[PDB]
Ligand binder design. Sequence first.
Ligand SMILES: C[S@@+](CC[C@H](N)C(=O)[O-])C[C@H]1O[C@@H](n2cnc3c(N)ncnc32)[C@H](O)[C@@H]1O
Ligand SMILES: [Zn+2]
Ligand SMILES: [Zn+2]
Ligand SMILES: [Zn+2]
Length: 425
Amino acid sequence: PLKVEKFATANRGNGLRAVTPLRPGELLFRSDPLAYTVCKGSRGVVCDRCLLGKEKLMRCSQCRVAKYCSAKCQKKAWPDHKRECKCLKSCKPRYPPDSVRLLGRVVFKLMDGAPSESEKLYSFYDLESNINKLTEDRKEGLRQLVMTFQHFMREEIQDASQLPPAFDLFEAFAKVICNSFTICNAEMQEVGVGLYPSISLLNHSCDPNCSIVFNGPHLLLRAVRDIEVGEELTICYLDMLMTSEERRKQLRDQYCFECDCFRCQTQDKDADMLTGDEQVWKEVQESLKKIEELKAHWKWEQVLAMCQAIISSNSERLPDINIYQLKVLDCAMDACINLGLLEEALFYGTRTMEPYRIFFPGSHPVRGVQVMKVGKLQLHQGMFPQAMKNLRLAFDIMRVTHGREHSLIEDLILLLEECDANIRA
Ligand SMILES: C[S@@+](CC[C@H](N)C(=O)[O-])C[C@H]1O[C@@H](n2cnc3c(N)ncnc32)[C@H](O)[C@@H]1O
Ligand SMILES: [Zn+2]
Ligand SMILES: [Zn+2]
Ligand SMILES: [Zn+2]
């Protein structure tokens, strides 16, 4: 039986609440997507189906756009790819926005597929559109996405008879804007976008009591605090390394609400996040636009070079608790790990540990994963007591955020055993 239920909230639409008392780490729901796609940066880098990276991917011969890890993935993907394949082929060399490829897959799934377990608690039909809150600038954007979909899909979808009953493309894209999930790989790299309509019942908090984690396209929802019967379940929609001003902007622009948690009234953590010289951090925040774009496209050498120019600047430097500096350290660590510069990775990674302790309170999967990365780098280098410390800590966090149902926890258990054996010997 379910441990969660849909309910009507007082002022934030529908939500999800606990039916039984919940403890940290408890699995509350699990879902495959209604629909998902690889994201722009990762296309041709990770398998379309399993979202795992490979050195060499095999392309779909018909469209040459979909790429796969294996014959098993290409074949398994074919039913959900076959209609988009003709559209992707037709519009070559144009490639659509991710939202447009996503909605195409939504439409084909709803037209051709059996009712989806992803819609058990709540359906695409039910999703919030916020249409009475959209600004004229947003409505113009949505109009353009509708016309882009009509162009991209024209080989497969010519009229309304090929859309679900009463389906309105403008409304559908408004639902995609505020109900898209970013799918992250095991290393917390963004690799895809998906719709998970049951999980879309969860409302936002800047200090949430649940968390989601991805294992390929599969989503696990877990409690990360004690929760009482009847208590609303929340997740944080946003990256933790954001000031209240930045959260306000994104919650308005993407989700059309004003968040009234304690952290937002009190600007909790903002001052410590913005320590250091403001001219310098403004420059680094600007440089991060490019660094994050490069990272999104897995360009690790260009990422490292830009990060080193900041971390080791001749000019004024920032404290590592400054969130822009911190994001630069984290990109530099990940670029080093991917490039096999393991000593340099560990330097950057260890610098992030105290700031991550501060900015990811409680049990947050991003901190779990960071601590595991650092442990693994220390294990490699023969630093056993320190690795063991960090691997235990990663486990204390990831037992709650990831759980036994997540494959990374098995990987971590193997590092723990290896490290323990080394210490014992
Ligand atoms: C993923 S949906 C969450 C479920 C939604 N309340 C519903 O009725 O379908 C996100 C939308 O929920 C509302 N929302 C989520 N968190 C909220 C919050 N903390 N305060 C006010 N509205 C919130 C906003 O309308 C937002 O665009
Ligand atoms: Zn695959
Ligand atoms: Zn194809
Ligand atoms: Zn808030």
